[PDB]
Motif scaffolding. Sequence first.
Motif, PDB file in Angstrom:
ATOM      1  N   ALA A   1      -3.775   8.839   4.143  1.00 53.99           N
ATOM      2  CA  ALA A   1      -5.045   9.406   3.926  1.00 53.99           C
ATOM      3  C   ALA A   1      -5.992   8.546   4.772  1.00 53.99           C
ATOM      4  O   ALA A   1      -7.115   9.088   5.405  1.00 53.99           O
ATOM      5  N   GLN A   2      -5.795   7.486   5.074  1.00 55.70           N
ATOM      6  CA  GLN A   2      -6.657   6.643   5.946  1.00 55.70           C
ATOM      7  C   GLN A   2      -6.820   6.903   7.466  1.00 55.70           C
ATOM      8  O   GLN A   2      -7.856   6.986   8.163  1.00 55.70           O
TER       9      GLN A   2
ATOM     10  N   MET B   1      -1.625   6.490   0.866  1.00 57.55           N
ATOM     11  CA  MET B   1      -2.939   6.199   1.294  1.00 57.55           C
ATOM     12  C   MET B   1      -3.110   5.431   2.608  1.00 57.55           C
ATOM     13  O   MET B   1      -4.077   5.880   3.072  1.00 57.55           O
ATOM     14  N   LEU B   2      -2.276   5.223   3.456  1.00 57.57           N
ATOM     15  CA  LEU B   2      -2.055   4.986   4.459  1.00 57.57           C
ATOM     16  C   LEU B   2      -2.165   6.218   5.504  1.00 57.57           C
ATOM     17  O   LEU B   2      -3.110   6.304   6.495  1.00 57.57           O
TER      18      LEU B   2
ATOM     19  N   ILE C   1     -13.835  -0.289  10.705  1.00 57.98           N
ATOM     20  CA  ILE C   1     -13.467   0.639  11.832  1.00 57.98           C
ATOM     21  C   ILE C   1     -14.324   1.641  12.220  1.00 57.98           C
ATOM     22  O   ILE C   1     -14.880   1.921  13.162  1.00 57.98           O
ATOM     23  N   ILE C   2     -14.734   2.402  11.189  1.00 57.36           N
ATOM     24  CA  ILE C   2     -15.722   3.299  11.296  1.00 57.36           C
ATOM     25  C   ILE C   2     -17.217   3.039  11.614  1.00 57.36           C
ATOM     26  O   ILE C   2     -17.803   3.499  12.863  1.00 57.36           O
TER      27      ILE C   2
ATOM     28  N   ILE D   1       0.770  -1.014   0.156  1.00 57.17           N
ATOM     29  CA  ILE D   1       0.140   0.011   0.032  1.00 57.17           C
ATOM     30  C   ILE D   1       0.893   1.182   0.030  1.00 57.17           C
ATOM     31  O   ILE D   1       1.778   1.241   0.800  1.00 57.17           O
ATOM     32  N   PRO D   2       0.645   2.070  -0.996  1.00 64.45           N
ATOM     33  CA  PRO D   2       1.556   3.336  -1.044  1.00 64.45           C
ATOM     34  C   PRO D   2       1.215   4.207   0.440  1.00 64.45           C
ATOM     35  O   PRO D   2       0.186   4.269   0.915  1.00 64.45           O
TER      36      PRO D   2
ATOM     37  N   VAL E   1     -17.525   9.657  -7.691  1.00 64.41           N
ATOM     38  CA  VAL E   1     -16.557   8.817  -7.953  1.00 64.41           C
ATOM     39  C   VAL E   1     -17.134   7.316  -8.350  1.00 64.41           C
ATOM     40  O   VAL E   1     -16.956   6.573  -9.284  1.00 64.41           O
TER      41      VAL E   1
ATOM     42  N   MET F   1      -5.414  -1.345  15.007  1.00 61.61           N
ATOM     43  CA  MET F   1      -4.459   0.027  14.752  1.00 61.61           C
ATOM     44  C   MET F   1      -4.376   0.682  15.894  1.00 61.61           C
ATOM     45  O   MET F   1      -5.489   1.142  16.449  1.00 61.61           O
TER      46      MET F   1
ATOM     47  N   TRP G   1      -9.297  -0.511   2.493  1.00 60.18           N
ATOM     48  CA  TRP G   1     -10.418   0.675   2.557  1.00 60.18           C
ATOM     49  C   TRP G   1     -11.595  -0.286   3.085  1.00 60.18           C
ATOM     50  O   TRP G   1     -12.738   0.347   3.356  1.00 60.18           O
TER      51      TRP G   1
ATOM     52  N   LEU H   1     -16.787   2.422  15.445  1.00 60.57           N
ATOM     53  CA  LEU H   1     -16.675   3.735  16.050  1.00 60.57           C
ATOM     54  C   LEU H   1     -18.270   4.249  16.516  1.00 60.57           C
ATOM     55  O   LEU H   1     -18.381   4.750  17.755  1.00 60.57           O
TER      56      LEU H   1
ATOM     57  N   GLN I   1      -8.756  10.389  -6.738  1.00 62.88           N
ATOM     58  CA  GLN I   1      -9.892  10.194  -7.403  1.00 62.88           C
ATOM     59  C   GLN I   1      -9.726   9.807  -8.881  1.00 62.88           C
ATOM     60  O   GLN I   1     -10.135   8.768  -9.358  1.00 62.88           O
TER      61      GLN I   1
ATOM     62  N   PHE J   1      -8.569  10.279   7.841  1.00 58.62           N
ATOM     63  CA  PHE J   1      -9.885  10.066   7.714  1.00 58.62           C
ATOM     64  C   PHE J   1     -10.208   9.503   9.124  1.00 58.62           C
ATOM     65  O   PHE J   1     -11.666   9.903   9.688  1.00 58.62           O
ATOM     66  N   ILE J   2      -9.768   8.466   9.603  1.00 58.70           N
ATOM     67  CA  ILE J   2     -10.313   7.825  10.855  1.00 58.70           C
ATOM     68  C   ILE J   2     -10.312   8.809  12.301  1.00 58.70           C
ATOM     69  O   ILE J   2     -11.352   9.026  12.892  1.00 58.70           O
TER      70      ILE J   2
ATOM     71  N   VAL K   1     -10.008   4.224  19.036  1.00 55.83           N
ATOM     72  CA  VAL K   1      -9.617   3.843  17.844  1.00 55.83           C
ATOM     73  C   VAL K   1      -9.058   2.071  18.021  1.00 55.83           C
ATOM     74  O   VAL K   1      -9.067   1.305  17.003  1.00 55.83           O
TER      75      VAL K   1
ATOM     76  N   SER L   1     -10.824  -1.216  16.106  1.00 53.25           N
ATOM     77  CA  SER L   1      -9.955  -2.102  15.199  1.00 53.25           C
ATOM     78  C   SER L   1      -9.692  -3.285  15.762  1.00 53.25           C
ATOM     79  O   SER L   1      -8.774  -3.863  15.374  1.00 53.25           O
TER      80      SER L   1
ATOM     81  N   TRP M   1     -16.463  11.510  -3.325  1.00 52.88           N
ATOM     82  CA  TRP M   1     -15.930  10.123  -3.383  1.00 52.88           C
ATOM     83  C   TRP M   1     -17.215   9.238  -3.679  1.00 52.88           C
ATOM     84  O   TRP M   1     -17.350   8.344  -4.341  1.00 52.88           O
TER      85      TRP M   1
END
Lengths: 103, 104
Positions: A8-9, A5-6, B95-96, A1-2, A91, A40, B89, B99, B11, A12-13, A32, A36, A88
């Motif tokens: 970004a995740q 991206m991690l 996870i969300i 995984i780039p 998308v 995490m 993802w 929560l 995106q 987000f969380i 958290v 998880s 998103w």
Amino acid sequence: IPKEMLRAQTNFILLMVLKQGDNYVYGIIKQVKEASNGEMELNEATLYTIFKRLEKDGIISSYWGDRRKYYRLTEIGHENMRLRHESWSRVDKIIENLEANKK
Amino acid sequence: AEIPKEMLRAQTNFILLMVLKQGDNYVYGIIKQVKEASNGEMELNEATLYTIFKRLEKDGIISSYWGRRKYYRLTEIGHENMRLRHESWSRVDKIIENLEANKK
């Protein structure tokens, strides 16, 4: 995984935790880790790095309780989270239709 | 409150890799295919597309070949990442999901 991206995740969380309620760093880490199932487990320093930048961009702010430091999602951040969740969504339909236009 | 520049980048990458996953394709056909499925909201630019595809070839996620026209295809390296990203993802949305439940 780039790595982007991690990053970004995790952003987000964290922002989704704050959307549920103002909270302090040890409290965020705990919630958290429970959500998880232990997968995490964040460390203090990662949060402070992330939170410094979010505050700088006006997406969160902080203040004292009663003494712990609480973090909160500002009005702009609730807004960004709405635009982001809509972005998103557009998308995912676009992708649905590509398969449709194929059929 | 604009969408962050890193997010629009992801995106567009995402959409593009899904195109290639359905089949090899060339730039004008990709731009064509994207605007039809978005009913015109999103009209990608050649220079941005050629810019982006260069990074992907450089990272070995796609490669190219000639027909007359130049075609791009998704490598195995690229098929893996698409799965890795998708499972990541998945783990995040759960996870969300939790929560929101743990609050009650």
